[PDB]
Amino acid sequence: MERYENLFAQLNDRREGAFVPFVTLGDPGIEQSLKIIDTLIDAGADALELGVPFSDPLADGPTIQNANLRAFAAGVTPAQCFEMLALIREKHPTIPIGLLMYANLVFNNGIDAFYARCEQVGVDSVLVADVPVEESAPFRQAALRHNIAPIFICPPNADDDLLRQVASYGRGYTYLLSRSGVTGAENRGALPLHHLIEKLKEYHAAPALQGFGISSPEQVSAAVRAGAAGAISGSAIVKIIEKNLASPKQMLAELRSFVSAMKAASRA
Amino acid sequence: MERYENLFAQLNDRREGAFVPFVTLGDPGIEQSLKIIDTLIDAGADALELGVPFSDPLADGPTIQNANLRAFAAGVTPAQCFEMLALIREKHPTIPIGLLMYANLVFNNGIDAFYARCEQVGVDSVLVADVPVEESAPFRQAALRHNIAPIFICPPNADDDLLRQVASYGRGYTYLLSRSGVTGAENRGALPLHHLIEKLKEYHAAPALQGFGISSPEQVSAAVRAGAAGAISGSAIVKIIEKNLASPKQMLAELRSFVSAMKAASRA
Amino acid sequence: TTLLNPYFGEFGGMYVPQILMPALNQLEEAFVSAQKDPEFQAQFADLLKNYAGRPTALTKCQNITAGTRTTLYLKREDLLHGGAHKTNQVLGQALLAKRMGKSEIIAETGAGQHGVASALASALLGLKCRIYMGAKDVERQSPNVFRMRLMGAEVIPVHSGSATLKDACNEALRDWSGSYETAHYMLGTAAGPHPYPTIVREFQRMIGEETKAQILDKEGRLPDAVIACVGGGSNAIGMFADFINDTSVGLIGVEPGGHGIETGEHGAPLKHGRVGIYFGMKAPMMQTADGQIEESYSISAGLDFPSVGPQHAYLNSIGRADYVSITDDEALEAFKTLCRHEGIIPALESSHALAHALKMMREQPEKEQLLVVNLSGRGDKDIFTVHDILKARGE
Amino acid sequence: TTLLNPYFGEFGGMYVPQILMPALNQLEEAFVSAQKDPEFQAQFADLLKNYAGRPTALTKCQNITAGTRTTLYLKREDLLHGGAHKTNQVLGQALLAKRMGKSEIIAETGAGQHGVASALASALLGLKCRIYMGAKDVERQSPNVFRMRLMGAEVIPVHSGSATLKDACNEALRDWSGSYETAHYMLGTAAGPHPYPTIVREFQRMIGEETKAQILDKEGRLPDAVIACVGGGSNAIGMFADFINDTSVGLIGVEPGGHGIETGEHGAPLKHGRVGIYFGMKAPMMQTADGQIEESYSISAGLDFPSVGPQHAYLNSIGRADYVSITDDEALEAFKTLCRHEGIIPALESSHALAHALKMMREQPEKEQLLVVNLSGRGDKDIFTVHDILKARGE
Ligand SMILES: O=P(O)(O)OCCNS(=O)(=O)c1ccc(OC(F)(F)F)cc1
Ligand SMILES: O=P(O)(O)OCCNS(=O)(=O)c1ccc(OC(F)(F)F)cc1
Ligand SMILES: C=C(/N=C/c1c(COP(=O)(O)O)cnc(C)c1O)C(=O)O
Ligand SMILES: C=C(/N=C/c1c(COP(=O)(O)O)cnc(C)c1O)C(=O)O
Ligand SMILES: [Cl-]
Ligand SMILES: [Cl-]
Ligand SMILES: [Cl-]
Ligand SMILES: [Cl-]
Ligand SMILES: [Cl-]
Ligand SMILES: [Cl-]
Ligand SMILES: [Cl-]
Ligand SMILES: [Cl-]
Ligand SMILES: [Cl-]
Ligand SMILES: [Cl-]
Ligand SMILES: [Cl-]
Ligand SMILES: [Cl-]
Ligand SMILES: [Cs+]
Ligand SMILES: [Cs+]
Ligand SMILES: [Cs+]
Ligand SMILES: [Cs+]
């Protein structure tokens, strides 16, 4: 499918950036997680980034570590995540869905079979956090064979060789990392680096989404003004879940408010 | 003076051995200690061996260690011991009195002055427990200059050279050690070694008193029958003191009984 | 692109977030440069000799092999400054850190021996050291926590997951992914992303080099086998490296069997796990059916890790090295035996290697065999743990 | 009659109950015999090298002398098997015990390092070991109690007197006076009756011999001074012996100053005591006006003794060696300084020597001086004690 290509074309026509929330699938349980995701979409999310719970998420800080733990406490497995994904797609036919994966979960029972499952349920992209471009060949090959976009990362200090590889190997969108470190709302990334944004465009890379530490509308506006196609926010969204565990209605109201504000900022 | 020579002559005339108790001077206090000593004499002691409390008595086992500690708890010092000795002698003009000393107490403010003090108060012998014959010269010289008998030890394994040195250097009596180890009533020494007794006589040594672990009349009888001139008992006597601290009248009655029985055994 | 091969057959690689790739490439280039630099080699050699106390003794057991045809020597890494083999490669990596213009060190530790090594090297060479340690290990290896702090290192308890070595590893790598501009990650075992398995081997290989020279001097031949415990794999690869091309010399690695392989409470992925990707490497690991990483277990904190370095996975695959396991109770018996019959108190990690050598002897007591056990560390850190066990046991 | 001189000037001798004289003469004859026996020398040398780890390193301090004209080396007895210099002479005395047909060992210990040494040597050489230790020291040096027991030694707490080293000494000698037919008394310091001060010196003298060779190699000259802490005197005489005839080389011994000499709570009889007779020797001791032996005090159990070996009293009397004191607080500062700036955790006993060397440097920082400190042991046994202090102190 062409879900990211179609989204970015539509956003361009409207002179708009993307707002893409991240949540952990099954946090704090399967049913509540499905309601959370429907709320994100209803409130204006342009695409989704969805985590499959993993035992040792080494690119995530405490907030998302804790999301993974809550999902595990609810007994969430990758198989249940794929069941959820099928239900999400069945409701929402056009929204791009990207998975945040750790390598072992993809490699586990065969890389090809993983990507084949993704295609079956209608996932659009997979980002494998601990697989750099240098180790990516079997992952990106399997992704493309199953019509899945493999997502690669452009770090702040990316050299020219890396820029060219990311532009060539990736599809769907390019991940523009705000900063070093791990996920976390408290650690605010720098302004989007115009030089990287411009080089990725020169090399015809998939459109850039800025992520890590994006927790406020101002940062979303700044990303789009710098020329990024949009922004991803995870920890800020997950904190709303964590805060409101005993108050599910309040959880959804606060998620709706936040997502709506972040999306409004993408029009800047 | 000739107090040991006179005693042994008298005992020989009566075909009798000596019984010589040991106590710590000032255990459990000065006044009670003086009463204890008068009781020992009244009950038949032929001579006395009297300890001056010392901080680290390395030839003594727990019983006599504890006697030293009780005297210290009563604030007993060597000066007070010399005051006691003067009082004992003033009451009892002929009984031989021997001191059990550790070297530091003799060496402390001058060896000569120590022996001069002994003569002043009318002490007859000094046994320095941690000075072997090999180190004895200044001690025995000072003793003889002040008419004090220096006492030397014949251990069970004494060789011929040692037998000759002890016979030559000692006066008053020869200490015939029952066994290796330290003082203690529970650890019974062997029978007097006839060979040592006979060799000491061949070499014209001062008469032998057997000591260490002698706690019963039978052992006193055995010492005399083997040809020793008598026997010393310390721990057995001190245990009676320790047992009866809250019962001073009972203490003296039991000391009297024990001493009387031990002395009776010396006639065997 | 790399200067050196990141793989050992199928195993190894550089499975880290893209952000960290420049740091790994920088470390690899600095290592290649240093390895050909006579000044660097002289500085490293001087520290090993005059500071750490190399060469370490090779001790012939006088008592524990009596009545058998086994001759057993112990390579005495327990006598190295700090009390374990860990000190060797820390001195090399600390010099690399300085070479790269870095003034801070991150390390993980389980037994606390790598943490002690990192702290002592940082104090000596003027680096600011922070050490991650699982909270369970903070308790069971407590003497090492006191040692690290007295040397001015910051010790950070890790309560997440199993609160043991893998959890400390996770936190160390998370930290480095944010602090690499100023901090060197002084990884303490022959595992993790390239170039660490290579650097750690090359900075531990004096163990086997000295062993070879010492056994030739004393016996006039090579050993029939060299035996070492395997956590991440550093002391074993340090002992093995110089013998790999001596085809007659057996290489035996001992993984922790924990409460028994059958209980699932062990740390023996090389023989009982399956290949996965975690902690920057493709290697055998203990994992669930779905590919979640399992928590390991061992009485010994230094072996309590659910993976293993990729060179060991490789040497096993081709049959050049054999890997076995030893349970907690076997390790404890070997600990007691060495204390009482040789007057050496071994680390519980090292006791796994000894236990296997004692089994080789006892199983076949008329088999003529010349063995070397790598006695990777001393057991001061373990004496409270062992005491508590033997007491509860009713000894 | 003896084969060797029991005195050093006025000091020394054989002030024991007559019962023990044959045992001392037997030990002296066995020592003289062994010293001329190439098989004995070869056995002792082999144990020192291949079991204990000699020669020990001589480490140049890189950091603590910065900005001064002091060059400081540390003789690394902390790297010897067991963790202190005590192990050297225990290996020699254990071989003497076997030579004399004895199968049991008695030892006293304060810091627990001599007890650990005695226990390890007994385990290795097949002797039954019992160790007396003051009850206060059982508490403040507790890691060593665990170590001794794991090696199969019997550890007997002594509650009498000060419950410290002198009290353990008293009990050891009392025991020996009853058990000498089967037991060797493995006295752990250069004190007590002849021939112990001589034997201990001769079986510790490799410390100074190696130091001399090492400093000649590294500096091309002798040290301006060698500095060692003094309890009974073994590590100091071991360092001093080979330098006595090098008249340019200063010999500096450091007694424990405790809470301060003026408080009377110290262990510095050589400089603040007076000659007495105790523990088999004529030597300086802390004593009352009437000649009772005083209780000493030091933060360090190994120095907490109210006398000193007779050769040190002699060397002082003739001016060949100088003796100073260091307080508990000075020792603690030196401990902290070495941990944080050199990455070495020293025994608190050894920290007294270091503290004095640091004073020599700091008092006269432009004085050119080449110093060696005997770092007599490692501080693992002390880490709990020091931690508790620094915490109560509010650090
Ligand atoms: O808003 P924050 O700070 O929580 O960031 C959320 C990001 N969630 S995500 O799925 O895009 C994401 C993307 C990449 C990650 O690691 C990698 F860069 F190494 F690949 C991890 C998470
Ligand atoms: O009856 P016991 O077992 O208590 O023995 C009591 C002995 N008391 S004593 O003064 O004769 C005495 C005699 C000699 C001593 O030591 C020495 F032999 F080394 F010199 C100690 C005490
Ligand atoms: C993990 C640690 N120790 C491991 C260890 C090991 C096992 O790690 P290697 O496989 O890397 O040698 C062996 N022996 C000793 C004395 C050890 O301390 C640590 O100290 O951090
Ligand atoms: C008394 C003991 N230790 C003393 C000691 C001393 C002081 O004792 P010498 O004066 O005998 O060296 C110095 N350094 C270390 C490490 C020590 O352990 C003992 O371990 O029994
Ligand atoms: Cl899979
Ligand atoms: Cl595509
Ligand atoms: Cl006097
Ligand atoms: Cl006379
Ligand atoms: Cl980067
Ligand atoms: Cl940090
Ligand atoms: Cl950084
Ligand atoms: Cl073989
Ligand atoms: Cl004898
Ligand atoms: Cl006994
Ligand atoms: Cl005996
Ligand atoms: Cl000088
Ligand atoms: Cs053998
Ligand atoms: Cs392991
Ligand atoms: Cs200097
Ligand atoms: Cs002292």
Resolution in angstroms comes to 1.5
Q: Does residue C229's CB lie within 6 angstroms of at least one atom of ligand 3?
A: yes
- Cβ–Cβ under 8 Å, residues D272 and D286: yes
| Torsion region of B26: left, alpha or beta (phi above 0 gives left; psi -120 to 50 gives alpha) | left
Distance between CA atoms of residues C52 and D132, nearest Å? 33
- The owner of tokens 């001087």 is C46
Q: Considering only CA atoms, which of D111, D70, D106, D93 is closest in space to residue D346? A: D111
C abuts D (3+ Cβ pairs < 8 Å) = yes
- The owner of tokens 């005997």 is D374
Distance between CA atoms of residues B216 and A152, nearest Å? 99
Q: What one-character DSSP code corresponds to residue C84?
A: B
Ligand nearest to the CA of A103: 5
What token pair was written down for C153? 């290192």
What token pair was written down for C300? 């010994």
Distance between CA atoms of residues C189 and B143, nearest Å? 75
- Cβ–Cβ under 8 Å, residues C172 and C188: no
Q: Considering only CA atoms, which of B68, B56, B16 is closest in space to residue B234? A: B68
What token pair was written down for C252? 């035996």
List the determination method: X-ray
Q: What are phi and psi of C349, to 5 degrees?
A: -60, -50
Distance between CA atoms of residues B123 and D152, nearest Å? 51
Q: What are phi and psi of C56, to 5 degrees?
A: -85, 150
- Cβ–Cβ under 8 Å, residues B24 and B34: no
Distance (Å) of CA A146 to CA A1, A47, A113, A121: 10, 20, 10, 11
Distance between CA atoms of residues B224 and B209, nearest Å? 9
Q: Does residue C349's CB lie within 6 angstroms of at least one atom of ligand 3?
A: yes
Q: Considering only CA atoms, which of D335, D321, D332, D333 is closest in space to residue D375? A: D335
Q: What are phi and psi of C254, to 5 degrees?
A: -115, 110
Of B2, B27, B42, B60, which is the active-site residue? B60
Q: Which residues in chain C are closer than 8 Å to A25, comparing Cβ atoms?
A: none
Beta-carbon separation of D119 and C383 below 8 A:
no
Cβ–Cβ contacts within 10 Å for residue C63, how many? 15
Structurally, at CATH architecture level, domain C53-85+205-390 sits in 3-Layer(aba) Sandwich (3.40)
The partner residue sitting opposite A78, judged by closest CB among C17, C160, C290, is: C290
Distance (Å) of CA B86 to CA B80, B143, B218, C69: 10, 18, 34, 77
Burial A2-35 (b: 16+ CB within 10 A, else e): ebbbebbeebeeeebbbbbbbbbbbbbebebbbe
| Torsion region of C283: left, alpha or beta (phi above 0 gives left; psi -120 to 50 gives alpha) | beta
Q: Considering only CA atoms, which of D98, D86, D28, D20 is closest in space to residue D52? A: D86
Distance between CA atoms of residues C108 and D343, nearest Å? 18
Nearest residue (by CA) to ligand 4, atom 17, is D302
Q: What one-character DSSP code corresponds to residue D259?
A: T
In a 10 Å sphere around its CB, with 0-12 CB exposed, 13-18 middle and 19+ buried, how is residue C394 labelled? exposed
Distance (Å) of CA C337 to CA A99, C63, C136, D154: 54, 10, 27, 17
Q: Does residue A232's CB lie within 6 angstroms of at least one atom of ligand 1?
A: yes
Q: Work out the widest C-alpha separation in chain C, in whole angstroms.
A: 59
Q: Which residues in chain D are closer than 8 Å to B67, comparing Cβ atoms?
A: none
> Is the preceding peptide bond at A93 cis, omega within 30 degrees of 0?
no
Distance from CA of A86 to the nearest CA of C (A): 19
Distance (Å) of CA A82 to CA A34, A36, A86, A117, A145: 12, 17, 6, 8, 19
For the sheet with D11-15, list strands across it.
D7-8, D11-15, D280-285, D274-278
Ligand nearest to the CA of C178: 11
Beta-carbon separation of D18 and B132 below 8 A:
yes
What token pair was written down for D61? 């301090």
Distance between CA atoms of residues B260 and C248, nearest Å? 86
How many angstroms does the Cα of residue D280 sit away from the middle of ligand 15?
18
In a 10 Å sphere around its CB, with 0-12 CB exposed, 13-18 middle and 19+ buried, how is residue C264 labelled? middle
Q: Where exactly are the structural domains of chain D? A: 8-52+86-204, 53-85+205-390
> Is the preceding peptide bond at B28 cis, omega within 30 degrees of 0?
yes
- Cβ–Cβ under 8 Å, residues D371 and D360: yes
The partner residue sitting opposite B58, judged by closest CB among D14, D174, D291, is: D174
Q: What one-character DSSP code corresponds to residue D272?
A: H
Distance between CA atoms of residues B193 and B197, nearest Å? 6
How far is residue B7 CA from its own chain's centroid? 15
Q: Does residue C17's CB lie within 6 angstroms of at least one atom of ligand 1?
A: yes
Beta-carbon separation of C1 and A182 below 8 A:
no
The 3-state DSSP class for residue D70 equals strand
Which of the residues of D are catalytic? 61, 85
The 3-state DSSP class for residue A130 equals coil
- The owner of tokens 């102190």 is D393
β-pairing, D322-327 with B18-24? unpaired
Tell how many helices (H) and how many strands (E) occur in chain D. 15, 14
- Cβ–Cβ under 8 Å, residues D116 and D148: yes
Ligand nearest to the CA of D22: 13
B abuts C (3+ Cβ pairs < 8 Å) = no
Of the residues A19, A126, A127, A176, which should be mutated to test ligand 1's pocket, given the most ligand atoms within 8 Å of the CB? A127
What are the DSSP calls for D82-127, one per residue? TSBTHHHHHHHHHHHHHHTT--EEEEEESSSHHHHHHHHHHHHHT-
- Cβ–Cβ under 8 Å, residues A223 and A19: no
Distance from CA of B57 to the nearest CA of D (A): 8
Domain D8-52+86-204 class, CATH top level: alpha beta
Q: Which residues in chain C are closer than 8 Å to D383, comparing Cβ atoms?
A: 143, 146-147, 150
Q: Where are the beta strands (DSSP E) in A220-263?
A: 230-233
- Cβ–Cβ under 8 Å, residues C265 and C228: no
Q: What one-character DSSP code corresponds to residue C48?
A: I
What are the DSSP calls for B151-220, one per residue? E-EE-TT--HHHHHHHHHH--S-EEEE-SSS-B-SSSPPPPP-HHHHHHHHHTTPPPEEEESS--SHHHH
- H or E stretch covering A92: none
Cβ–Cβ contacts within 10 Å for residue D103, how many? 13
Q: Work out the widest C-alpha separation in chain D, in whole angstroms.
A: 59
Residue C174: closest C-alpha in chain A: A58
Q: Considering only CA atoms, which of B16, B21, B15 is closest in space to residue B47? A: B21
The partner residue sitting opposite D290, judged by closest CB among B77, B129, B181, is: B77
Could you tell me how many residues make up chain C? 395
| Torsion region of D101: left, alpha or beta (phi above 0 gives left; psi -120 to 50 gives alpha) | left
Distance between CA atoms of residues D108 and C318, nearest Å? 56
Distance between CA atoms of residues D375 and A121, nearest Å? 70
What token pair was written down for C297? 């277990």
Domain count, chain A: 1
Rg of chain A over Cα atoms, rounded to whole angstroms, equals 17
What token pair was written down for B208? 């032998």
- H or E stretch covering A116: helix A111-121
Domain extent, residue B253, equals 1-268
Distance from CA of A159 to the nearest CA of C (A): 9
What are the DSSP calls for C66-80, one per residue? TTSSEEEEEEEGGGS
What token pair was written down for A21? 């929330």
- The owner of tokens 């006979």 is B198
What are the DSSP calls for C242-299, one per residue? GGTT-TTSEEEEEEEEETBGGGTBS--HHHHSEEEEETEEEEEE-B-TTSPBPP---S
What are the DSSP calls for B24-84, one per residue? ETTSS-HHHHHHHHHHHHHTT-SSEEEEPP-S--TTB-HHHHHHHHHHHHTT--HHHHHHH
